[PDB]
Amino acid sequence: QRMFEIDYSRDSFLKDGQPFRYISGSIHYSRVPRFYWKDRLLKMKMAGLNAIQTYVPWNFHEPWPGQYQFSEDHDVEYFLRLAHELGLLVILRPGPYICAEWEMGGLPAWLLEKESILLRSSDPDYLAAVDKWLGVLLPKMKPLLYQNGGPVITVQVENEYGSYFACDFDYLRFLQKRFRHHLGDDVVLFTTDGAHKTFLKCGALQGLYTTVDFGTGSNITDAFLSQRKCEPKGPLINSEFYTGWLDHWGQPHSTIKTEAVASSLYDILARGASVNLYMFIGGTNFAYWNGANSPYAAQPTSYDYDAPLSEAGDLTEKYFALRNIIQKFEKVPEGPIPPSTPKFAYGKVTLEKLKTVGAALDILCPSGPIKSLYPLTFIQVKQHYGFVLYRTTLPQDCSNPAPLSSPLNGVHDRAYVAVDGIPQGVLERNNVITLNITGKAGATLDLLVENMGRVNYGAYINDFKGLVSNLTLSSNILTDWTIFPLDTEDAVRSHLGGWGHRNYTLPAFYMGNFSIPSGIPDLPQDTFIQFPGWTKGQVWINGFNLGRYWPARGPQLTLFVPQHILMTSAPNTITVLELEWAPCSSDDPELCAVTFVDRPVIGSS
Amino acid sequence: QRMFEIDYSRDSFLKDGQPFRYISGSIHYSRVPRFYWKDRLLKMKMAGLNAIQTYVPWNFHEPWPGQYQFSEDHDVEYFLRLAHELGLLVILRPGPYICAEWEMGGLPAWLLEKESILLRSSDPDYLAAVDKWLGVLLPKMKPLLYQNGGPVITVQVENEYGSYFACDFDYLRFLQKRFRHHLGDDVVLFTTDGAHKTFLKCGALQGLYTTVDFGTGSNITDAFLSQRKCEPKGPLINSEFYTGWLDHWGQPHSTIKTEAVASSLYDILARGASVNLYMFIGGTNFAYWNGANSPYAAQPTSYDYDAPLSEAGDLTEKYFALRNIIQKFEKVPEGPIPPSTPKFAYGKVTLEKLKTVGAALDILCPSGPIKSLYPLTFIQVKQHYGFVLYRTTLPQDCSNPAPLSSPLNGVHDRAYVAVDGIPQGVLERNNVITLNITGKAGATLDLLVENMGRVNYGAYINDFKGLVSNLTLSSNILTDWTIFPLDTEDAVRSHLGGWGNYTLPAFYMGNFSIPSGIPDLPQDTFIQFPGWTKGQVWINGFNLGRYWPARGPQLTLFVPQHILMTSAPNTITVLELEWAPCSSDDPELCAVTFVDRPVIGSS
Ligand SMILES: CCCC/N=C1/SC[C@@H]2[C@H](O)[C@H](O)[C@@H](O)[C@H](O)N12
Ligand SMILES: CCCC/N=C1/SC[C@@H]2[C@H](O)[C@H](O)[C@@H](O)[C@H](O)N12
Ligand SMILES: *[C@@H]1O[C@H](CO)[C@@H](O)[C@H](O)[C@H]1NC(C)=O
Ligand SMILES: *[C@@H]1O[C@H](CO)[C@@H](O)[C@H](O)[C@H]1NC(C)=O
Ligand SMILES: *[C@@H]1O[C@H](CO)[C@@H](O)[C@H](O)[C@H]1NC(C)=O
Ligand SMILES: *[C@@H]1O[C@H](CO)[C@@H](O)[C@H](O)[C@H]1NC(C)=O
Ligand SMILES: *[C@@H]1O[C@H](CO)[C@@H](O)[C@H](O)[C@H]1NC(C)=O
Ligand SMILES: *[C@@H]1O[C@H](CO)[C@@H](O)[C@H](O)[C@H]1NC(C)=O
Ligand SMILES: *[C@@H]1O[C@H](CO)[C@@H](O)[C@H](O)[C@H]1NC(C)=O
Ligand SMILES: *[C@@H]1O[C@H](CO)[C@@H](O)[C@H](O)[C@H]1NC(C)=O
Ligand SMILES: [Cl-]
Ligand SMILES: [Cl-]
């Protein structure tokens, strides 16, 4: 009979009747390839952590209603068993909103098919979908509960609900009742909110243990007092002690000094508190999984976060200094630590243009476009992530430049504009709502619109995407739209159909191959791909979407490439979808190339 | 149909009728695990070599008469097909004698069952043995000749015969005849000798193309003049251009500056000469495979050689330097070069004592010992490598110390002496032929004798090993011996039976685990022996070689990752011959350490 509980009498957890305090690190299994789960988890164990904490992003597991992903890189059950086999306990944060610098804070975009839905509230439509998601997810976690022989010792309900405007306590009571129904009356349920009464007001609930979060800039005494007002008795817990911080494109890369982190960790531990390091490994927002903040600013592909373990899982100075801190309180496992992986510079690899997006429309949109008088959103045309091509014809001669505009600032989030196959430039959420264009009356006007990531924090998480309001040309609303949802992922995996089915340039797919020898024990290795002369796009290797590149803005100039998607003898196909400008016109094919390097550049300006 | 031949008009080889010269590197498949054959060969290719050169060590393949090893790490045919697959031609050096700093120059020790055998000569028993061996090896090599669609473009007959005292030309002509019988009339056959008329005199032969060897210290024009005396027409060839040099235990690790090698290499190539770099990768003398020179000094376990590729295959500054030289003459292949392998320090691993050699004789010698009035050699008791225990009892009281001595210096090569289980010290070939001992009359006198490797060069390659002459005690010949050949390789593989200032020779064992499901573990490592003195080491039953931190220059031994497992613990076993750091009550001293860098140049 295995037990995990709060002992209110002695301000402690009890694990099997014995006092217990956790030292945890965040790892998001959705941001680490499964190939490397055990590697990251074993390094976390060797640092002295006795637990890990993760989020379950609902949108990562239920891409459309009733259609679930629980295998391979989506196998949360396996991740938790792996943690358990390593002797680690788990703090599960299943949401249903998780924030987390992740697309729409984890909420599936198809929730937005009800335009007026009030997310994270007792809206009956939101609740009905949450209920259905919890009926699938929770019974899976039940056998992984500590009391049932698994690792899961506590479970978070919602995520900083106190920061949201709605203050719907009915919603939190409904979550609590349903977590209880599926998981039982013994599991420790808790909430997390910023360490201040203003946040705790709407975040805390009778029957859910109130914890706080705070990083190196906060007064430790003040923070735990804010916690003590809601929980006079029980353990002190900091559920997200920030070891670093998130990035945005075009802003320099956030760091926090190792000393500051080590010093605050020591002081937190010295109080007897349980603590979780956010992040311990950050990893990667592969594909389109990044979030954004409001006013609109997308977080980049790397989630390195300046964590103790780097994006590719490397041991850093920070890691060793935090291990050292932990060692002052607990005995840390003996033996050598698993190393930073070897990285290899495969060097320069030439690409060439295969087809423009406009030429590949047949393969990108095999069931045909949707026609509409006025523009429809991504949600309305049944596309959540990536790109949607919006097409109409010019209703006037524009031999002299005519302004193309979105007067309500409804290009969400970027649009690459062409007229009869001539690029005209870019429309941008907030920054540029008007673009002058030229072409003849009746010319085809194309806007390739990119979802740069759904806001994951604040009031404006109901971020539909696409052209969310009208466009005008010379102040006259443009009508008669042909709208092509683009199955970029399928298409890239069929080599735009070539493999069957068993100043600006036009958005286009550029492809290239490189070989790695077989029979070499240390190849393939992890690497980093760099894009000198390119501008902004999406990159795949052998059909695995590595994420977004944007060396024009930085600070990230390289993307992490994990070894297990690379093949020997058989050619590795790189696909680059360049959106703005490719270095491939001049008759110097050598410039139309990418480079594999053996160190990240996520800092260079 | 493919042709390779000497054209005496262009002073050149012709490959398929067109001018060809080779730029080759030596790699010994016997000194690199097969797990790493493709790695080393591809790194060779990426340096711009169009060929490799290798020795076939006879004793690596015919350990006893008519018992053959050609599988796995002994799969020479596969190695040649691998070279070919990668676009490398092959210069084959099948011996039967190869020198090579390799046990007895490759010659099987069982040839010494004829005590009087004149090795590398017309001795009819030596020839009948060689002929039987050629009759197994050469039919295997015939399909791998260039003309039959394989990689092998030239074949060396013997090895520096000009340096051997015998000068038996009928021996050379016999080899020529047998190689021709098995391989045909088209294969280019050649010889290699030192670049000077004194060496060429007894090493060259009509019908065998004469080549020379030399290194960075020699006048290149004069070396090639000495070749031209013998072959006034044909390709200039340096068959062994020294990129480095051999070591001996107790002497400073040898090195040769990159600048010198690159400089000489460029000079050689510029003359249009074909050339082989000796070594390009050297590798390791695992188990007991190392040789020795006269006066007796054994070469160490590492054959790093200061080669362009390190013992563990790492890309060195020398490697990129010679690559850059080769690039001035031939387009080199494109793409990145396979990397130096990652190395991991597994840290400290504690061992404990398992059993002394003395207490282990049931398992080391399950057949029972051999009795003899006087001592017998390793050969006579049918053991070639490792250790033999010689046992007698003292015929007189020795309360006062008495001289135990080998008046004819007949301890080949080192003996660890105990009386009634009390260590007495060491007798050493050429260095310590007397040792005072004490004990009661009737006490057991034990001498654990080590074959430290059979001389591979010079007159004294007929190196039997063991107690090869009598031992005297207080000037009297000791008699009535009880001799135990020791099956160390089996006993270590069975964990010595049990299966679920000096110390007595003894085996120590410990375990360490490596986690599974970690994409980059296990890794290669280097094992180090702080506090130990001299011994042998096995990991998971694989004999990695000899350690001797007491003499150096080699401190660490190379440990290839593929013998390391994650599914069950890895066992280390040390046989320590002189002094183990394990008597103190601190168990933590009884230990070895794995580190991520080699120390082969200790001062
Ligand atoms: C106003 C400042 C909010 C506190 N800071 C951060 S830094 C990054 C994390 C994640 O967004 C996490 O999901 C959060 O729960 C937390 O929101 N958070
Ligand atoms: C005394 C020096 C003579 C030339 N040097 C060396 S250095 C190491 C090599 C090998 O022993 C080779 O087998 C021999 O053929 C060659 O002897 N050799
Ligand atoms: C933190 O606040 C407490 C009062 O709550 C104060 O006494 C203390 O000096 C403060 N410490 C720091 C480091 O600001
Ligand atoms: C568009 O063109 C007009 C001239 O007709 C000019 O006044 C305006 O600045 C231009 N707008 C942009 C956004 O470049
Ligand atoms: C477009 O224009 C008309 C206003 O005339 C309005 O009825 C319609 O809602 C607008 N649609 C969008 C998507 O903004
Ligand atoms: C890249 O490799 C794939 C798979 O063989 C092939 O379909 C494509 O045509 C290749 N391009 C080149 C230059 O090899
Ligand atoms: C080599 O010897 C030749 C004469 O045979 C001499 O002319 C030449 O200078 C020597 N070369 C070197 C580098 O010593
Ligand atoms: C060792 O041998 C020498 C030879 O002179 C002898 O005289 C000496 O007494 C011996 N020493 C011991 C400690 O037995
Ligand atoms: C040892 O001495 C004996 C008796 O003098 C002699 O017959 C024999 O040849 C010697 N044996 C060896 C191995 O030296
Ligand atoms: C294997 O390894 C450990 C060292 O961690 C050792 O203590 C143990 O005795 C070994 N196992 C057995 C069965 O002897
Ligand atoms: Cl988390
Ligand atoms: Cl060779």
XYZ file of N, CA, C and O in Angstrom, chain B residues 310-432:
492
model
N 46.089 8.259 -34.766
C 46.521 7.807 -33.438
C 46.096 6.355 -33.186
O 45.364 5.788 -33.955
N 46.604 5.741 -32.124
C 46.254 4.379 -31.776
C 44.734 4.159 -31.831
O 44.249 3.154 -32.388
N 43.983 5.125 -31.305
C 42.530 5.035 -31.294
C 41.869 5.592 -32.569
O 40.649 5.795 -32.608
N 42.664 5.861 -33.601
C 42.141 6.311 -34.870
C 41.909 7.815 -35.022
O 41.328 8.199 -35.975
N 42.398 8.653 -34.090
C 42.110 10.070 -34.077
C 42.806 10.807 -35.187
O 43.946 10.464 -35.547
N 42.167 11.866 -35.671
C 42.752 12.650 -36.755
C 43.812 13.608 -36.191
O 43.484 14.478 -35.433
N 45.076 13.466 -36.538
C 46.098 14.283 -35.864
C 46.529 15.418 -36.764
O 46.172 15.457 -37.927
N 47.315 16.331 -36.224
C 47.887 17.380 -37.038
C 48.753 16.809 -38.155
O 48.730 17.295 -39.293
N 49.493 15.754 -37.838
C 50.242 15.013 -38.864
C 49.312 14.517 -39.983
O 49.649 14.626 -41.175
N 48.131 14.003 -39.625
C 47.209 13.528 -40.632
C 46.861 14.660 -41.629
O 46.852 14.429 -42.805
N 46.551 15.854 -41.158
C 46.019 16.906 -42.057
C 47.174 17.458 -42.864
O 47.019 17.814 -43.974
N 48.339 17.442 -42.262
C 49.555 17.883 -42.880
C 49.918 17.041 -44.105
O 50.240 17.579 -45.137
N 49.850 15.719 -43.968
C 50.166 14.785 -45.093
C 49.056 14.791 -46.102
O 49.293 14.759 -47.310
N 47.813 14.894 -45.621
C 46.723 15.112 -46.540
C 46.984 16.337 -47.448
O 46.837 16.256 -48.650
N 47.343 17.466 -46.862
C 47.668 18.647 -47.647
C 48.810 18.445 -48.640
O 48.780 18.984 -49.723
N 49.810 17.657 -48.273
C 50.878 17.301 -49.248
C 50.308 16.501 -50.418
O 50.532 16.850 -51.575
N 49.504 15.480 -50.109
C 48.951 14.594 -51.132
C 48.074 15.385 -52.107
O 48.141 15.175 -53.337
N 47.273 16.306 -51.559
C 46.464 17.230 -52.358
C 47.201 17.994 -53.442
O 46.593 18.415 -54.405
N 48.499 18.191 -53.304
C 49.255 18.915 -54.316
C 49.497 18.039 -55.530
O 49.861 18.538 -56.579
N 49.249 16.744 -55.396
C 49.531 15.775 -56.443
C 48.326 15.058 -57.006
O 48.364 14.651 -58.166
N 47.301 14.849 -56.167
C 46.089 14.121 -56.533
C 44.891 14.842 -55.916
O 44.935 15.226 -54.754
N 43.818 15.024 -56.680
C 42.535 15.396 -56.069
C 42.153 14.351 -55.032
O 42.191 13.165 -55.287
N 41.823 14.852 -53.852
C 41.462 14.087 -52.683
C 39.919 14.025 -52.603
O 39.222 14.874 -53.171
N 39.365 12.983 -51.973
C 37.913 12.913 -52.011
C 37.240 14.049 -51.225
O 37.859 14.663 -50.378
N 35.981 14.321 -51.543
C 35.243 15.444 -50.960
C 34.319 14.968 -49.854
O 34.064 13.794 -49.727
N 33.809 15.919 -49.079
C 32.924 15.646 -47.976
C 33.712 15.706 -46.693
O 34.937 15.793 -46.710
N 33.009 15.631 -45.554
C 33.691 15.694 -44.276
C 34.397 14.355 -43.942
O 33.999 13.310 -44.415
N 35.451 14.406 -43.135
C 36.149 13.185 -42.735
C 35.474 12.609 -41.481
O 35.107 13.367 -40.572
N 35.316 11.284 -41.422
C 34.792 10.713 -40.196
C 35.635 11.149 -39.041
O 36.824 11.234 -39.168
N 35.011 11.408 -37.894
C 35.692 12.046 -36.791
C 36.545 11.074 -35.963
O 36.381 9.855 -36.059
N 37.409 11.659 -35.143
C 37.961 11.011 -33.990
C 36.828 10.515 -33.118
O 35.845 11.228 -32.914
N 36.942 9.306 -32.584
C 35.878 8.755 -31.794
C 35.776 9.541 -30.506
O 36.789 9.967 -29.962
N 34.548 9.744 -29.991
C 34.417 10.292 -28.651
C 34.987 9.367 -27.606
O 34.885 8.157 -27.748
N 35.560 9.950 -26.556
C 36.219 9.180 -25.479
C 35.555 9.557 -24.146
O 35.148 10.748 -23.917
N 35.401 8.564 -23.287
C 34.682 8.777 -22.027
C 35.518 8.276 -20.890
O 35.952 7.146 -20.943
N 35.704 9.106 -19.857
C 36.285 8.665 -18.574
C 35.229 8.009 -17.711
O 34.434 8.721 -17.109
N 35.191 6.676 -17.637
C 34.254 5.994 -16.742
C 34.615 6.164 -15.251
O 33.808 5.848 -14.400
N 35.791 6.716 -14.951
C 36.188 6.978 -13.599
C 36.909 5.814 -12.949
O 37.477 4.939 -13.632
N 36.851 5.797 -11.614
C 37.532 4.811 -10.804
C 36.679 3.550 -10.667
O 35.498 3.634 -10.414
N 37.266 2.372 -10.853
C 36.593 1.109 -10.564
C 37.444 0.262 -9.601
O 38.608 -0.042 -9.874
N 36.838 -0.104 -8.475
C 37.465 -0.868 -7.426
C 37.456 -2.341 -7.830
O 36.489 -2.839 -8.424
N 38.587 -2.996 -7.544
C 38.766 -4.402 -7.738
C 39.002 -4.994 -6.378
O 39.465 -4.306 -5.480
N 38.727 -6.278 -6.243
C 39.265 -7.039 -5.124
C 39.968 -8.290 -5.615
O 39.737 -8.761 -6.731
N 40.805 -8.831 -4.735
C 41.558 -10.031 -5.008
C 40.645 -11.206 -5.206
O 39.637 -11.384 -4.514
N 40.977 -12.004 -6.198
C 40.195 -13.166 -6.497
C 40.986 -14.364 -6.011
O 40.537 -15.103 -5.142
N 42.192 -14.521 -6.549
C 43.018 -15.666 -6.259
C 44.434 -15.379 -6.699
O 44.641 -14.769 -7.763
N 45.407 -15.837 -5.914
C 46.772 -15.870 -6.365
C 46.932 -16.910 -7.475
O 46.175 -17.875 -7.558
N 47.955 -16.741 -8.298
C 48.266 -17.762 -9.304
C 48.444 -19.122 -8.599
O 47.833 -20.135 -8.974
N 49.231 -19.107 -7.542
C 49.448 -20.287 -6.698
C 48.169 -21.009 -6.338
O 48.088 -22.223 -6.501
N 47.155 -20.265 -5.893
C 45.907 -20.887 -5.413
C 44.980 -21.263 -6.549
O 43.956 -21.900 -6.343
N 45.354 -20.885 -7.766
C 44.485 -21.047 -8.924
C 44.881 -22.186 -9.878
O 44.323 -22.274 -10.971
N 45.825 -23.046 -9.495
C 46.445 -23.984 -10.464
C 45.505 -25.065 -10.994
O 45.672 -25.543 -12.126
N 44.515 -25.442 -10.185
C 43.415 -26.337 -10.617
C 42.719 -25.865 -11.883
O 42.384 -26.672 -12.755
N 42.490 -24.558 -11.965
C 41.759 -23.986 -13.093
C 42.720 -23.553 -14.226
O 42.322 -23.572 -15.381
N 43.955 -23.176 -13.885
C 44.929 -22.740 -14.873
C 45.597 -23.888 -15.540
O 46.095 -23.740 -16.658
N 45.613 -25.036 -14.862
C 46.265 -26.211 -15.389
C 45.427 -27.473 -15.100
O 45.858 -28.349 -14.331
N 44.256 -27.601 -15.750
C 43.400 -28.741 -15.420
C 43.993 -30.094 -15.852
O 43.527 -31.104 -15.359
N 44.985 -30.111 -16.756
C 45.597 -31.371 -17.189
C 46.623 -31.915 -16.248
O 47.094 -33.029 -16.438
N 46.998 -31.144 -15.244
C 48.069 -31.547 -14.368
C 49.398 -31.097 -14.926
O 49.550 -30.939 -16.134
N 50.374 -30.882 -14.046
C 51.687 -30.405 -14.453
C 52.554 -31.487 -15.074
O 52.218 -32.658 -14.989
N 53.660 -31.057 -15.667
C 54.676 -31.919 -16.267
C 55.876 -31.981 -15.334
O 56.401 -30.959 -14.934
N 56.310 -33.193 -15.004
C 57.519 -33.432 -14.214
C 58.757 -33.561 -15.099
O 58.705 -34.211 -16.109
N 59.877 -32.983 -14.698
C 61.082 -33.059 -15.506
C 62.283 -32.908 -14.615
O 62.266 -32.120 -13.675
N 63.339 -33.653 -14.907
C 64.517 -33.622 -14.061
C 65.095 -32.210 -14.108
O 65.398 -31.632 -13.061
N 65.216 -31.662 -15.319
C 65.680 -30.284 -15.515
C 64.558 -29.446 -16.137
O 63.583 -29.980 -16.637
N 64.696 -28.123 -16.097
C 63.618 -27.279 -16.649
C 63.408 -27.444 -18.181
O 64.401 -27.621 -18.941
N 62.133 -27.407 -18.601
C 61.722 -27.388 -20.015
C 61.233 -26.010 -20.459
O 60.649 -25.260 -19.666
N 61.431 -25.725 -21.746
C 61.001 -24.461 -22.382
C 59.479 -24.353 -22.600
O 58.784 -25.351 -22.637
N 58.980 -23.126 -22.811
C 57.575 -22.905 -23.195
C 57.168 -23.826 -24.329
O 56.148 -24.461 -24.229
N 57.998 -23.910 -25.387
C 57.709 -24.771 -26.558
C 57.508 -26.264 -26.221
O 56.632 -26.927 -26.778
N 58.353 -26.770 -25.320
C 58.390 -28.172 -24.967
C 57.190 -28.566 -24.180
O 56.745 -29.686 -24.317
N 56.670 -27.654 -23.354
C 55.416 -27.905 -22.631
C 54.209 -27.379 -23.395
O 53.149 -27.285 -22.817
N 54.383 -27.024 -24.677
C 53.269 -26.719 -25.573
C 52.492 -25.447 -25.217
O 51.306 -25.335 -25.524
N 53.162 -24.480 -24.611
C 52.583 -23.155 -24.461
C 53.394 -22.097 -25.212
O 54.601 -22.084 -25.130
N 52.736 -21.234 -25.967
C 53.445 -20.255 -26.784
C 53.561 -18.879 -26.144
O 54.641 -18.244 -26.222
N 52.461 -18.451 -25.513
C 52.303 -17.104 -24.990
C 51.985 -17.109 -23.541
O 51.505 -18.106 -23.015
N 52.207 -15.974 -22.907
C 51.815 -15.764 -21.509
C 52.819 -16.273 -20.454
O 54.023 -15.969 -20.496
N 52.309 -17.089 -19.547
C 53.011 -17.435 -18.324
C 53.080 -18.955 -18.068
O 52.110 -19.669 -18.336
N 54.233 -19.420 -17.563
C 54.413 -20.801 -17.114
C 55.009 -20.812 -15.697
O 55.921 -20.052 -15.394
N 54.450 -21.658 -14.838
C 54.875 -21.767 -13.454
C 55.861 -22.909 -13.303
O 55.528 -24.042 -13.580
N 57.063 -22.595 -12.860
C 58.069 -23.620 -12.587
C 58.207 -23.816 -11.078
O 58.447 -22.850 -10.337
N 58.086 -25.063 -10.646
C 58.048 -25.387 -9.225
C 59.086 -26.440 -8.866
O 59.180 -27.479 -9.524
N 59.852 -26.157 -7.814
C 60.708 -27.152 -7.184
C 60.670 -26.991 -5.654
O 59.915 -26.162 -5.120
N 61.427 -27.818 -4.941
C 61.565 -27.617 -3.488
C 63.021 -27.440 -3.167
O 63.873 -27.958 -3.878
N 63.293 -26.663 -2.117
C 64.657 -26.324 -1.743
C 65.365 -27.578 -1.182
O 64.822 -28.227 -0.275
N 66.544 -27.934 -1.752
C 67.365 -29.091 -1.345
C 68.335 -28.837 -0.169
O 69.115 -29.712 0.174
N 68.262 -27.659 0.439
C 69.153 -27.254 1.518
C 68.481 -26.122 2.280
O 67.666 -25.385 1.721
N 68.814 -25.971 3.551
C 68.230 -24.901 4.339
C 68.803 -23.575 3.886
O 69.972 -23.483 3.496
N 67.956 -22.553 3.945
C 68.252 -21.242 3.392
C 67.860 -20.141 4.386
O 67.327 -19.096 3.997
N 68.115 -20.385 5.675
C 67.784 -19.410 6.714
C 68.648 -18.187 6.527
O 68.207 -17.058 6.726
N 69.891 -18.432 6.142
C 70.745 -17.401 5.604
C 70.406 -17.310 4.116
O 70.201 -18.331 3.473
N 70.319 -16.094 3.569
C 69.937 -16.012 2.158
C 70.925 -16.747 1.228
O 72.127 -16.695 1.465
N 70.403 -17.456 0.221
C 71.234 -18.165 -0.764
C 70.987 -17.588 -2.136
O 69.853 -17.215 -2.446
N 72.038 -17.542 -2.972
C 71.889 -17.103 -4.355
C 71.109 -18.108 -5.196
O 71.540 -19.259 -5.364
N 69.948 -17.667 -5.683
C 69.264 -18.320 -6.786
C 69.674 -17.594 -8.059
O 69.519 -16.367 -8.184
N 70.221 -18.349 -8.996
C 70.773 -17.748 -10.179
C 70.605 -18.585 -11.436
O 70.455 -19.805 -11.366
N 70.659 -17.891 -12.578
C 70.615 -18.516 -13.880
C 71.948 -18.237 -14.531
O 72.107 -17.240 -15.232
N 72.927 -19.113 -14.311
C 74.283 -18.673 -14.683
C 74.433 -18.356 -16.167
O 75.227 -17.501 -16.520
N 73.647 -19.005 -17.013
C 73.702 -18.743 -18.459
C 72.634 -17.720 -18.917
O 72.420 -17.522 -20.103
N 71.981 -17.060 -17.971
C 71.056 -15.970 -18.302
C 69.898 -16.563 -19.081
O 69.564 -16.099 -20.130
N 69.329 -17.621 -18.518
C 68.349 -18.474 -19.164
C 66.935 -18.282 -18.638
O 66.097 -19.186 -18.763
N 66.666 -17.111 -18.073
C 65.297 -16.755 -17.677
C 64.769 -15.892 -18.789
O 65.064 -14.714 -18.829
N 63.998 -16.519 -19.684
C 63.414 -15.874 -20.834
C 61.872 -15.685 -20.623
O 61.088 -16.562 -21.009
N 61.422 -14.543 -20.094
C 62.174 -13.298 -19.991
C 62.187 -12.635 -18.631
O 62.873 -11.652 -18.421
N 61.412 -13.157 -17.708
C 61.239 -12.525 -16.429
C 60.504 -13.542 -15.578
O 59.553 -14.194 -16.039
N 60.942 -13.662 -14.329
C 60.402 -14.641 -13.413
C 60.074 -13.983 -12.100
O 60.864 -13.205 -11.579
N 58.903 -14.301 -11.572
C 58.435 -13.746 -10.294
C 58.605 -14.869 -9.331
O 58.008 -15.927 -9.473
N 59.492 -14.661 -8.376
C 59.955 -15.769 -7.500
C 59.247 -15.744 -6.154
O 59.125 -14.704 -5.546
N 58.743 -16.890 -5.723
C 58.230 -17.033 -4.367
C 58.780 -18.294 -3.709
O 58.945 -19.320 -4.380
N 59.041 -18.207 -2.396
C 59.407 -19.375 -1.576
C 58.415 -19.550 -0.437
O 58.283 -18.662 0.402
N 57.722 -20.685 -0.424
C 56.621 -20.946 0.525
C 55.590 -19.818 0.524
O 55.056 -19.440 1.573
N 55.317 -19.280 -0.662
C 54.331 -18.219 -0.805
C 54.797 -16.857 -0.321
O 53.992 -15.948 -0.191
N 56.088 -16.705 -0.058
C 56.631 -15.408 0.251
C 57.371 -14.888 -0.988
O 58.361 -15.459 -1.387
N 56.911 -13.763 -1.558
C 57.609 -13.163 -2.692
C 59.089 -12.888 -2.434
O 59.442 -12.339 -1.407
N 59.952 -13.235 -3.377
C 61.389 -13.006 -3.198
C 61.927 -11.961 -4.132
O 63.007 -11.464 -3.908
N 61.185 -11.605 -5.174
C 61.675 -10.636 -6.154
C 61.667 -11.171 -7.580
O 60.902 -12.072 -7.922
N 62.541 -10.627 -8.413
C 62.442 -10.839 -9.830
C 63.793 -11.140 -10.433
O 64.763 -10.462 -10.143
N 63.838 -12.160 -11.277
C 64.975 -12.377 -12.184
C 64.580 -11.856 -13.584
O 63.431 -12.059 -14.019
N 65.515 -11.184 -14.262
C 65.252 -10.497 -15.548
C 66.331 -10.860 -16.576
O 67.514 -10.813 -16.273
N 65.912 -11.187 -17.790
C 66.826 -11.506 -18.907
C 67.751 -10.335 -19.127
O 67.298 -9.199 -19.235
N 69.043 -10.631 -19.201
C 70.098 -9.654 -19.478
C 70.426 -8.645 -18.383
O 71.373 -7.886 -18.549
N 69.693 -8.683 -17.268
C 69.675 -7.605 -16.281
C 69.787 -8.030 -14.810
O 70.394 -7.318 -14.035
N 69.135 -9.129 -14.418
C 69.247 -9.690 -13.069
C 69.183 -11.211 -13.190
O 68.099 -11.814 -13.372
